[PDB]
Structure formats: C-alpha cells, structure tokens
C-alpha cells in the first residue's frame with residue numbers, strides 16, 4: 508500500500524523498489540552522502556551561503572551518488588522556523604521560505620534527479636545528539652508525534668525511502684552504571700525506560716501506520732547489556748549508534764520486510780579507539796571488530812545492513828592513520844557486499860571528519876573520493 512505509487516521493501520538483505528503502476532520491481536543500492544544542517548541552529552542544509560541548492564544536488568549526482576541521508580531536529584520540521592545562512596542571491600527561489608518548505612523543495616527536486624532520501628531524526632534540540640529518544644523536557648510521545656507528522660507529510664514524496672528513527676543512541680556514563688543508571692540507551696535489559704530495541708518497535712510501528720510504504724532504519728546503541736558487551740573483548744568500544752552485538756539475542760520486532768539495521772562506524776579522526784594502535788594489529792585487526800559489532804547481522808543473520816555514517820579527514824589536516832582506516836573499511840565493505848551506505852559527510856564543515864567537498868564548498872578531495880567510489884563501481 509502506498510500514497511506515492513512507490514513501495515519499498517527488504518527481501519533477504521536487499522532493498523527493492525516497487526512501482527505499483529508500471530508493475531516494476533527492482534533491487535536498489537544506496538550510494539549515499541549525508542547533507543547536514545537542518546539539525547543545527549541554521550535550520551537548513553549548510554553551504555547555501557556559497558552554493559545554489561539545486562547545483563549541490565546536481566553535483567552530488569554527477570559524482571555517482573543516488574541517495575542523501577538528511578538529518579533534522581524537531582524545530583526544523585515545524586512550520587515557521589526561520590533558516591539562517593542562505594545567499595538568496597544564489598538561491599532566489601528560497602526567499603521567504605521556512606525550513607520546512609526548503610526541505611520539501613530539496614526533497615522534491617532530489618526526486619526529479621532520481622536521488623533517494625532517508626529522513627534522519629538527528630537531534631531533539633538543535634545543538635547536540637541526546638543519548639535517549641526523549642529528555643526531561645521532551646517525551647517519547649512527543650518524539651513519536653513529531654515522526655508521525657513528518658511521515659504524513661513526506662510520505663507523499665516518492666523518493667523518500669523511510670526513517671532513520673533516532674541518530675546515535677548512546678550513553679553518557681560508564682558501565683556498569685550505564686546499564687541501569689537510566690542516563691543512556693541500552694539493548695536487551697528488558698527495561699522500557701532505556702531499551703532502544705524496544706523503543707524502535709514502538710516508534711517504528713507508529714510510522715508504518717502512516718507510511719506503510721517506508722523502510723525503518725534502526726541504528727545500534729553504544730552499550731547494550733552487560734552480558735552481551737562483556738562477551739567480546741571490544742564490546743565496550745563500539746561507536747555511538749554502532750553497537751549491534753545485541754541483535755542476535757534481541758532482534759527488533761518490526762516486519763522483516765521493512766526493517767533495516769543501520770550502524771555507524773568511524774576512524775581515528777573521530778576517536779582514538781584503543782584498537783587503532785599498530786601494536787594492536789591495526790588495521791588488519793579491523794575486519795573482525797567490524798564483524799563483531801555489526802557485520803554479522805548481515806553476514807550471519809542475513810539482515811539488510813546499511814552503514815548510516817562513516818568518514819574522516821583522509822590525511823588532510825588529520826591523523827594520517829585515517830587514510831589506511833578508510834581504505835581498509837571500503838576494502839571490507841566491497842568484499843563482504845555491504846553495498847548500501849551513507850558517507851559523512853557531503854559537507855566540508857564537519858569538525859572531526861571534513862567531507863567529500865573541500866573547504867571552498869566547490870571542489871572535492873580527489874583521493875578521498877577515489878577511495879569511496881570503489882563502492883560505486
């Protein structure tokens with residue numbers, strides 16, 4: 508069932524797109540990039556002070572990408588939020604539009620270009636990623652209502668493939684405190700106050716009620732439960748939204764044909780993880796770590812796994828080990844058929860990662876892009 512005539516579904520570990528009108532059904536791949544800004548105080552994708560928004564989408568497509576993960580915050584999706592940081596001289600058709608109208612315009616145009624869009628509820632506020640899907644201030648029912656409103660609106664755009672429920676569930680304290688102190692996300696504690704896996708079924712079910720044709724992207728947490736995390740030597744060193752070690756024993760209960768697990772994984776430019784030390788076997792020790800944290804969900808369990816974020820400076824003003832790290836990760840994704848992904852980020856203005864575009868928001872980093880395009884064939 509679909510309001511657009513397009514229906515998305517997971518068969519095995521492959522995402523398929525169905526056109527109910529022509530009857531066409533083909534598998535699709537997501538060669539994506541994250542274009543952020545709608546989750547920041549700007550309330551609009553960044554770079555429009557230097558580029559025309561349409562030109563940005565065209566350039567993204569020209570490089571072989573066919574998908575964009577679009578992060579947003581609660582404020583950006585409500586009527587009337589004023590965006591800041593747009594050169595209207597370059598973006599005349601954006602004059603007088605609120606953030607919601609600009610998002611609509613961008614998504615509609617991305618569709619004309621054949622670019623898929625994944626909506627990502629990145630932050631409740633607009634300044635940072637919260638560890639849980641609710642705060643002292645904002646309840647879970649508010650979170651879900653925000654999603655319901657977003658789904659009823661954007662569900663009408665054919666190229667929107669679904670929802671990445673919550674960006675990077677994580678913890679702010681250490682374990683074992685973290686598993687019960689209630690300040691962070693968990694998985695398999697059988698505790699509804701902090702179990703992201705239990706939360707995902709709830710949020711996801713609400714969204715599917717209004718957008719049945721959508722896919723539901725579920726990220727990992729940081730820590731899961733002490734049994735799971737302790738059963739692996741690097742079980743306490745997974746990235747925020749990067750721990751899917753608990754999926755085996757605690758699958759997320761959403762229809763199999765709608766669920767997509769979406770882990771995040773980073774390099775040394777983001778955090779100097781202990782396993783990045785050469786004396787620890789870096790980078791040849793990585794495949795097994797990636798396998799344990801999330802790879803097995805696809806390779807062993809057969810689920811669709813779409814890396815939601817990964818990136819780094821690739822040696823440009825950053826830790827030189829990051830070049831090796833990205834080269835190794837892409838090697839591994841290609842070998843193991845992790846064909847769907849979203850790179851962080853299209854934007855060059857990411858403090859610890861830089862992006863595909865250089866600081867001038869116009870030219871790209873050739874070596875970084877040449878490594879990544881191996882995934883695009």
Ligand SMILES: OC[C@H]1O[C@@H](O[C@H]2[C@H](O)[C@@H](O)[C@H](O)O[C@@H]2CO)[C@H](O)[C@@H](O)[C@@H]1O
Nearest residue numbers: 675743744745746747748773777778859
């Ligand atoms: O996940 C992105 C996030 O990582 C933060 O570092 C964490 C890391 O995720 C975790 O695996 C490690 O064990 O602890 C560190 C410190 O919290 C990093 O600080 C953020 O900048 C980054 O966005």
